[PDB]
Amino acid sequence: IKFESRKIMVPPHRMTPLRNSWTKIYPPLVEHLKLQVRMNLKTKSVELRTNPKFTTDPGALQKGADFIKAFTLGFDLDDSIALLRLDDLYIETFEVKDVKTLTGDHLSRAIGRIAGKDGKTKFAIENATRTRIVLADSKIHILGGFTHIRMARESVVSLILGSPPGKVYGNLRTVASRLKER
């Protein structure tokens, strides 16, 4: 366990939530991972370094870095804490534009279609696929297990391409049933 460092730049729009949640962020990093934590106000970036004397798990530093990065992308804190707890969680990212070139009102409606009324359509996908989805404007991030995220990506892509929410919701129930079977 050698002396190493990591830096993750928090965007302006997320740091106040970092201020909002940081009381619950440094404890797990410092006690469990034995990680020495700091963030530079001047650069507005979190600085993580491995302390050779106390830190023991070689993957601790990278685990913490992804944990903040999970928080940075917009995921809620407890959703990100799962990353620290587990080892097989990854984040999938892509734009709507790769799926389809949508602009103006077409783009806005596509984002609305994914979220659904009161976020129900997004709440549909998250539970069935056992993942979390962040709809950051035209930017989509999915957190979960590798196999899990791929089902989630498919349903989201189907909505972007124009599949109405109802047929997507029906398919979610089908795959949701198969998840319980296995």
């Binding site: 407890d78 959703d79 804490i81 799962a82 707890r85 587990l86 969680l89 976020g119 129900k120 709440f123 549909a124 998250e126 539970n127 069935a128 056992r130 993942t131 979390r132 957190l143 979960g144 297990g145 919701y169 979610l172 129930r173 949701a176 049933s177 319980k180």
Partner: peptide
């Protein structure tokens, strides 16, 4: 089977632990 359309109370640590156990 009916799928919930509201935010899950359980956190992903909790869901994945339930999967584990």
């Amino acid at each position: 089977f009916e799928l919930s359309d509201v935010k899950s109370s359980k956190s992903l640590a909790e869901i994945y632990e339930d999967d584990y156990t």
